[PDB]
Amino acid sequence: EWRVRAISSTNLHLRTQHIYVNSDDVKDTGYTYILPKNILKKFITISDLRTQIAGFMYGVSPPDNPQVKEIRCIVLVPQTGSHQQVNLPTQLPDHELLRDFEPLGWMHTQPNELPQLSPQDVTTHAKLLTDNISWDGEKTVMITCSFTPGSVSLTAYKLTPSGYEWGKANTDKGNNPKGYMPTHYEKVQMLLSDRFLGYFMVPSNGVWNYNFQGQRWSPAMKFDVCLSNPKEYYHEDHRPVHFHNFKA
Amino acid sequence: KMLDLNDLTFSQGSHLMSNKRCELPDGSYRRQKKSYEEIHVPALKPRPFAEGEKLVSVSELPKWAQPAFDGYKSLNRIQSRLCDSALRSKEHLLLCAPTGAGKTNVALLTMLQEIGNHLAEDGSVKLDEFKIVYIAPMKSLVQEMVGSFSKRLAPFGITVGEMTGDAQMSKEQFMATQVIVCTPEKYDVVTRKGGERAYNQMVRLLIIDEIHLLHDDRGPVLESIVVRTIRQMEQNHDECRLVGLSATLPNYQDVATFLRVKPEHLHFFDNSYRPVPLEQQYIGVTEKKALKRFQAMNEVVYDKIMEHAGKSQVLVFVHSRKETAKTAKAIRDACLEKDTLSAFMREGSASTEILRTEAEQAKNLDLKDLLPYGFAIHHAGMNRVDRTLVEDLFADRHIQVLFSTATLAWGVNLPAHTVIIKGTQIYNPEKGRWTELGALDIMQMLGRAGRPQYDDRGEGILITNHSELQYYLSLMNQQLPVESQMVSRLTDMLNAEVVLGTVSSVSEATNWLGYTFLFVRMLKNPTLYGITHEQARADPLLEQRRADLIHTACVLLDKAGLIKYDKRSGIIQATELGRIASHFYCTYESMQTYNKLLVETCSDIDLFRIFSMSSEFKLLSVRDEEKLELQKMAEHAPIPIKENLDEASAKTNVLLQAYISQLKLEGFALQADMVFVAQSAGRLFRALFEIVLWRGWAGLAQKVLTLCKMVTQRQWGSLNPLHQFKKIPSEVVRSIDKKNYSFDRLYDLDQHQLGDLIKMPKMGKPLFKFIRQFPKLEMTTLIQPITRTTMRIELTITPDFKWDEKVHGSAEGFWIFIEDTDGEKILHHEFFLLKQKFCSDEHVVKMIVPMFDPMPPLYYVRIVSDRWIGAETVLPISFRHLILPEKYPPPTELLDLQPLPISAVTNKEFQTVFAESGFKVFNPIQTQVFRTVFESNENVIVCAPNGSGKTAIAELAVLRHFENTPEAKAVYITPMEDMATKVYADWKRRLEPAIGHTIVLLTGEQTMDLKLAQRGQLIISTPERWDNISRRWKQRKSVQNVKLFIADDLHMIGASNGAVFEVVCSRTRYISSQLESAVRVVALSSSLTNARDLGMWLGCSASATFNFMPSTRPVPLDLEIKSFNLSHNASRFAAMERPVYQAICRHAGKLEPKPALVFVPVRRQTRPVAVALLTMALADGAPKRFLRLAEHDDTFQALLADIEDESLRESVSCGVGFLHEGTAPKDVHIVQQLFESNAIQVCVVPRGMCYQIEMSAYLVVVMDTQFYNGKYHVYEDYPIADMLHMVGLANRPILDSDAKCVVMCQTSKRAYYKKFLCDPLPVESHLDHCLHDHFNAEIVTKTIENKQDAIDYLTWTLLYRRMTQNPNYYNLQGTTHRHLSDALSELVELTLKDLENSKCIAVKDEMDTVSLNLGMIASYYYISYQTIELFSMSLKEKTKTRALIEIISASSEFGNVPMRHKEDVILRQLAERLPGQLKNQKFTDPHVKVNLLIHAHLSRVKLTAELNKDTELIVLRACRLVQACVDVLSSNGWLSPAIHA
């Protein structure tokens, strides 16, 4: 029951008329995170409705405010999606400009409601934190957007020390754990910007989603970035296997 | 009134039988049989020869014409009769003759008549003075005619070229071809494209083959061509002979009237003139049951073969490739069933042995099976070798019965005794259904019946339905009238006239429509066109009927958005969509659909959907028998379809994907449909690409552009580009695909690694060659911010591939796109054409992009190949280090001050200077600044728009200075010599008597100019001339005695030569400081953004810094910018011609014509444009509309008689002047006098004379904004300062209350000019590029003795100020004093190191600078250091006179001699005439030009006025170079070379 899912990708631009910051929060203690409307609107249209996709983001402080954080670049990465998890290599994106940023974002797309997070998210962040000694979990936060009907919600989260220790402690499929829990989770302050543009880094070969190319995908999988615009999901270069059976 | 065009359209097309009865020839008889009925028409006997009618021998033709008839003894009967009309008359010719009667040789006779008009005295043909166009109905026939004429025209050196829908001739190929053979549609598209307008004027002969296509639905294409030609001939008076070739059909007298053929040239030859008399048998199947009807046809075919078996060869035509083998075998089996096969082949014949032997070599198995039996097949699916072999075997009479497709009748002249047409129904994919065979096919099939000289008579058997028998009878018995189908295409045809601009009103449309053949037919048969006899009597001219038709079409075209139609005035204006639509032959309904459905968010699925929704496919229906086959295809479709599979739109989409996927189709009709869809896809997707490009949707444009390649390459974009190289086996590339090896990495692999990767070492070297031949381009960018809102990007393109004419052709096209950070909006787009001649040179393209707030982080520069898949390169331009320039200070407000009268100047002598200049009261701008300039001695800068009388401000400073200090010297510097001449001549006339002091203009001669500066109190000079003198200021007290320095048009510092201007201005203040002598600086300029920065650099007070807005002109200026979407300038010129004339009617008005000035890019353009305007005035019936004085005015007649140029004298007699650099000053003065007196309304002036002419006009017209720079081989844009100068001439404050300006430029430049013409101009320094020569001069004078001394001087320059305002322009990384100081230190080191490397100076102790002899020579003679180094490197102990000319010609001082377009050809002709010149010289290099011109001067060869003017400049420059060589050689101690110098 595939082909309509390709067709459904058409309408993703419509959801961009109804983006919302899910602003039910009070913790002004959150190092308030600022995301720009341009890259978000693109990240909507390049998504795929019936699967998660994800990326990493890199930040600048405004020079006049150290604790406000502006998200300034998204790195899309080689990835294989899933309906309600995402597969990301242990390989870390790196570039001069990224190292010249302050490096703090990761975000994923949610098909639907999200009354709570996924443990795959936390374990990803915990694993990510476990690799990224630079990152520090008190600095670094996790973000979700949801394909609500005709709309998008924006919501953002932090992982507590009890969060990290849980992911550090955990190594499981973890469908109904203990410690997958609010002391382990945190909600943090984040904002949307019309005030400036950001930009995308992408893989050196462009092809970020794999899925049917998951045979090509690996958790090890060395890759690099290039500073190019993102190809959309169902772009030909992502989907070429459909053209290669019908060669004759 | 709105009419229904569908009801008036003949849905039957070619089957329209307008004759109600058919009369049979004498002896015709009917035979009714059991299953079929035969109607026999006997073969007509040839008419006897008339008294005196004899065959004209080829020897009777002129000897120069005889080579075209080599191998021919005499002309035929028809050709003999037309010899006078064809060879001796230039009048239009219509030949009505039976098919096969030798029309092709009659066409050749007409060609010779034109060749005779262009035959030179030596017997050569002036191949460049004329062109011949041959219109043929089919591509196969085009190929046949090209081959024939190639043999027949070879003795004349005539080049024959094919120009078809698929075979597009390049313009260079077009130039080399004199006779072009083409299709109607291709010639229409060619004429629609406008590119060949300059070529259409050279077309002197048009031959229209099978013009009776007028009865077919394609007939309107021929009408368009003829009407366009007639309207062009009548309007332009360019004679082109029309030659119509037609069948023997009624209404030929109307066609002659339509073709303007005089009755003397109307030739009708009945069917008795057919070379072989044809007996005709018409078989009308009466069976009502379709199956029994089909069965009866099979019976007839076998029966007639047996009737002719062994008696005569039979050629059986069928409509399908599969039908050839199936029918042939079925009849063969029927021949086997009745044991009649032996009648075809006599047992033991050599032909049986031949056919069996050839069958063994035949690759086609069905042909191989049939060939032993004497049967063969011929169809387009067979290979060319087997087809040619079958053709030969039938020509040799080996094949007795041949089954073939229509292509043989159209592609091979293979006549046969007997022709049998099995069935007359053919599947029409355009109509989606089975339709009757076209008349042309029947006539071509019947044209092959009867072999001349071998058969006494031919027999033609036509098998058809009993209902259709009368139609084919009417066709062959001269009874089928040719009717017009124009109604089906009237909208599209009318659109073409609007796009060409030949029709702009309902009156013009009614006139244009009066030339159509439809109009002749409507007049001749109103009842057929839905016009009642009463209606035709009330409107005998059908004016209302035509206007109602036109009105309906205009509303439809307006409703489609192709035109703007004012229903009241009837005015029609073309839109951009109409142009695109016309250029790609798309219907208005499809464009209207596209206009409705196309959005920026369109996906790939929507693009296919929108394409499938095209109205061209409206007649495609879904067949029940094909849904199941479509079902299999739908499962294999790689792109999802949103529409239901039952919809006709979906079917079209499926077919396209299969073709791109190269899928094999089973249904023949489906396969036919696929080709039809595929053939249309190429032009339609190309049109869509232009639409999205026009709207600027970057991401969509890249997609559509990729799809165009997919259609061309028949492959999906995901496949490796190597698949495009059809010479590489697909299996090899698939082995790479199976390995998932990236294409980019293939460039790094060697041929062995590549061969090993594919496990085929033999293919490694060929692939590597193909790999290194694949188009790849490298990009480097120079980023230059101009303003806080605008940035210049200079893109240098380096080709990194090996050119191959068989792969890349003569030129390859590339699209350069600058996309925003998101890739959504096209910020800039350009078409780059890499030519084979320049495939080794790097191309630098300068472009300017707008900047938005908030600042984007980066932009993307994307270059995309126009044809090659995957040949693209993307370069992100990061703004992380972009330091935006400071916000400019607000402009000076124009105070509403009371106008100062001329009496305000206290000196009565000074009042006369302005009274003589026509001043009564000072303008508001002058009034506000008068007090600061005339009463105060402060430094002042006045930036004001052109036409505000800025020149008077300099005069006031001069008048006041000598009034107060008559003994003190004043210097006025202007960058243009022509302006200096104007100012000097006018001031010498007006100011010198009022001031009583000698005014001098410097000439450039160092010794004489020094005397002039001493003698003259007021010195007018150019910066360059003044720089040479000011160098020795320390010794020249007269320079020290200069107290006033006026720098006019200071904005020219931003031009190429501004570096000298900045230095001259900078030194003036330094000298002013060192002498304790304040030199008052008065700066006059156009409105500037950074006017205060220059004022501060000049020491002007803030109160003395006047910067008025461009809108504050005393005369309001109306600026209209019209954009032309033509990248080819020569084509663009012809597109601008008529809008200019239209602008005169619209802007300069009828009844009260006002003076209009038209600027053209070149002298060569002046005269053609003037003639075109007169031609349009003549076409309007008012040739002298532009003249305002009486023709018999004695002063006008006296002035006319004083004009030396007869063509100018003639043009002026109608009120239109034209000027050029070769016009005598007296004639120029007369034209100026006539224009100022308003005697003549229009004057044509080249861009080079804008500073030379003094005329001011109400309307200024800038015809194009580009000139050809032959050094870079690129057409360069006009400098904005020059543009402002031309616009500045739109100023007549005493005669006109307002001014109009129409700037015609390329669409890509509209935003550029729109910005800088409305807003003030930012001026930046270019001194950094010329520091060496300036640095050397001050070191020679010991002004700079150390590196710090150079730095200190630099602090006085304007550069130092601007470096702080726009660091990134100057590659500075910061605005701090350290970064400024550090960057300055590096620049000094680099400049001085270069001077040290050139041995011009010597640096002692790495700090102190010592001038060397080379520096002294360069500084003394004012020669560039680059030339002095070259002389040091090029001069040798044995250099001789010839080598000296070469070395001197290579000097940088000659690197600025202008190279004009096609000037290399004239230089080539000169080099062939001069002794000892090398034939392999680069005739496009100015150094070669100077070398050739030097030898021509020494040989006293008479040169053109342009080259003479060039020669004068060259010789003057050479004198310094020769003198400079003497000093260089003396420093080296070589006696003999110095003597040679």
- The answer to whether A229 contacts B719, with C-beta atoms less than 8 Å apart, is no
Mutation target among B597, B603, B704 for the A interface, most CBs of A within 10 A: B603
- Contact at 8 Å (CB) between A76 and A200? yes
Name the token pair of A103. Answer: 């490096």
With 0-12 / 13-18 / 19 or more C-beta atoms within 10 angstroms meaning exposed / middle / buried, residue B1402 is middle
CB B1050 within 8 A of CB B1083: yes
Torsion B272-B274-B278-B280 (CA) sign: negative
For residue B746, give the H/E element and its range. Answer: helix B743-746
Strand partners, B245: B95
Which experiment gave this structure? cryo-EM
Virtual torsion, Cα B1139, B1142, B1144, B1147, nearest 10 deg:
-100
Q: If you write DSSP's letter for every residue of B1003-1053 in order, what string do you get?
A: -S-HHHHHHHHHH-SEEEE-HHHHHHHHTTTTT-HHHHTEEEEEEESGGGG
Angle at B539 between CA B533 and CA B542, to 5 degrees: 100
Query: DSSP for B1257-1271?
Result: -SEEEEE-SEEEETT
The residues of A whose Cβ lies within 8 A of any Cβ of B are 3-4, 6-7, 9-10, 13, 38, 42, 72, 97, 195-199, 205, 216, 227-229, 234, 236-237, 239-240, 242-244, 246-248
Contact assessment for residue B184 and residue B218, using Cβ atoms and an 8 Å cutoff: yes
Q: Which residue type sits at A233?
A: Y
* CA angle (B1213 as vertex; B1210, B1217 as ends), nearest 5: 80
To the nearest 10°, report the CA torsion of B1270, B1276, B1280, B1286: 70
Question: Which residue of A207, A227, A229, A241 to mutate against B (max B Cβ within 10 Å)?
Answer: A229
Q: Cα–chain-centroid distance for residue B1023?
A: 40
Tokens of B557: 């075209």
Among B303, B230, B258, B222, CA closest to B33: B303
Q: Half-sphere exposure (CA, 13 Å, Cβ side) for B1239?
A: 22
Q: Measured between alpha carbons, how far is B401 from B519 in angstroms, rounded to an integer?
A: 47
Residues annotated within the binding site of B are 97-104, 944-951
Cα–Cα distance between B3 and B555 in angstroms, integer? 11
Q: Which two tokens stand for residue B326?
A: 């199936």
Local structure of A61: helix, strand or coil:
coil
Contacts of B856 in chain A (CB under 8 A): 197
Q: How far A165 CA sits from the closest chain B CA (Å)?
A: 38
**What's the resolution in A?**
2.9
Can you tell me the distance from the alpha carbon of B1504 to that of A184, in angstroms, rounded to the nearest whole number?
91
Structure tokens at B390: 């079958």
Distance (Å, rounded) from C-alpha B1037 to C-alpha B1043?
A: 12
Give dist(CA A82, CA A61) in Å, integer.
Answer: 33
Q: Is the peptide bond before B854 cis (omega within 30 degrees of 0)?
A: yes
CA distances from B833 to B33, B583, B1001, B1305 (A): 69, 20, 46, 20
Helix (H) or strand (E) holding A65: none
Name beta bridge partners: B799.
B777
Residue type (1 letter), A244: H
Strands B375-378 and B425-428: unpaired
Among B1108, B1042, B1049, B1121, residue whose Cα is nearest residue B1079: B1042
User: Per the CB < 8 Å rule, is A9 touching B603?
Assistant: yes
B701: phi then psi, degrees, rounded to nearest 5: -60, -40
> What does each C-alpha distance from B1491 to B133, B1272, B1291, B1468 come to in angstroms?
42, 19, 44, 12
Dihedral over Cα of A199, A203, A207, A209: its sign = negative
C-alpha neighbours within 13 Å on the C-beta side of residue B1218: 24
| Tokens describing residue B1093 | 């920065």
Tell me if residue B1234 falls in helix, strand or coil: helix
Distance from C-alpha of B380 to C-alpha of B384, rounded to nearest angstrom: 8
Residue type, A22: N
Q: Which residues of B touch A197 (CB under 8 A)?
A: 821-822, 854-857
Asked if B683 and B614 touch (Cβ cutoff 8 Å), the reply is no
The SS3 of residue B1349 is helix
Closest CA to B979 of B947, B1029, B1021, B944: B1021
Which positions in chain A touch B642 (Cβ < 8 Å)? 7
> Pick from A88, A119, A107, A81: which is nearest to A209 by CA?
A81
Q: Diameter of chain A by CA atoms?
A: 63
Percentages helix, strand, coil for chain B (3-state, rounded to 5) are: 50, 15, 35
Q: Which of B1113, B1168, B1481 is nearest to B1298 (CA)?
A: B1113
For residue B661, the chain A residue with the least C-alpha distance is A247
Which of B716, B862, B882 to mutate: most A Cβ within 10 Å? B716
Give the span between the Cα atoms of B272 and B78, in whole angstroms: 12
- Residues belonging to chain A: 248
d(CA B1493, CA B1322): 40
Q: Which amino acid is at B799?
A: P
- Nearest of B1188, B1151, B1158 to residue B1173 by alpha carbon: B1158
| Two structure tokens written together for B1381 | 């100081």
Whether B162 and B148 have beta carbons less than 8 Å apart is answered as: no
SS (H, E, C) B705-723: HHHHHHHHHCCCCCCCHHH
